[PDB]
């Protein structure tokens, strides 16, 4: 995603990118991005840890998930809004056209 997307079509790091094995390409990308919309996706995605913490109806540790996600959904709405402003330059035409 990071490479064949965002970064260049968004014009940012035209230095395409390079991960190792600790902190994640989806997250660090954050510290280095200037489009808030884009920027929230990043922390939320890198931080949405399947809230491994539950003890219901009497002893049922069933690693749960965000009200947010649940049906607050917005995440989606925001995942979209961020997308709504990724429409720009760098390489051949048949590219942005097709992608966007």
Partner 1 sequence: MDVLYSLSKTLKDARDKIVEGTLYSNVSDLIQQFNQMIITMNGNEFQTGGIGNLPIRNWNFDFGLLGTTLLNLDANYVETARNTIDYFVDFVDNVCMDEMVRESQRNGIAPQSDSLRKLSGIKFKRINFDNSSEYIENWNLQNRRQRTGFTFHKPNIFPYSASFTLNRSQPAHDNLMGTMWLNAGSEIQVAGFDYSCAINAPANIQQFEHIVQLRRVLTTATITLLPDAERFSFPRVINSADGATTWYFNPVILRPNNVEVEFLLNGQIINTYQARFGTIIARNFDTIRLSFQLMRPPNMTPAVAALFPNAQPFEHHATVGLTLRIESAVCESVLADASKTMLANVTSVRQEYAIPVGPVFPPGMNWTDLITNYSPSREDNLQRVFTVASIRSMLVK
Is there binding between residue 10 and partner 1 (CB under 8 A)? yes
Q: At what angle do helices 75-83 and 36-47 cross, to 10 degrees?
A: 140
Binding partner of residue 11 among partner 1, its own copies, none, CB cut-off 5 to 8 Å per kind: partner 1
Q: In the numeric block, which tokens belong to residue 25? A: 């390409």
Binding partner of residue 92 among its own copies, partner 1, none, CB cut-off 5 to 8 Å per kind: its own copies
3-state secondary structure (DSSP) of residue 22: coil
Tell me the C-alpha distance between 28 and 19, whole Å: 10
Contact between 7 and 16 under an 8 Å Cβ cutoff? The reply is yes
* Binding-site string for its own copies from residue 19 to residue 48, where x marks contact by CB under 8 A and - marks none: --xx--------------------------
Q: Which of 31, 71, 92, 98 binds its own copies (CB under 8 A)?
A: 92
Q: How many CA atoms lie within 13 A of 90 on its CB side?
A: 20
Residues contributing to the site for partner 1 (CB under 8 A): 10-13, 30-36, 38-40, 42-44, 47-48, 85-89
């Amino acid at each position: 995603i990071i490479n064949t997307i965002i970064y260049p079509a968004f014009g940012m790091q035209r230095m395409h990118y390079r991960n190792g094995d600790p902190q994640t390409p989806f997250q660090i990308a954050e510290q280095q991005i200037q489009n808030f919309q884009v920027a929230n996706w990043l922390h939320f995605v890198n931080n949405n840890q399947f809230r491994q913490v539950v003890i219901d109806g009497v002893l049922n540790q069933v690693l749960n998930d965000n009200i947010r996600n649940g049906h607050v959904v917005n995440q989606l709405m925001e995942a979209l809004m961020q997308l709504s402003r990724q429409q720009f330059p760098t390489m051949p035409v048949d590219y942005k056209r097709s992608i966007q």
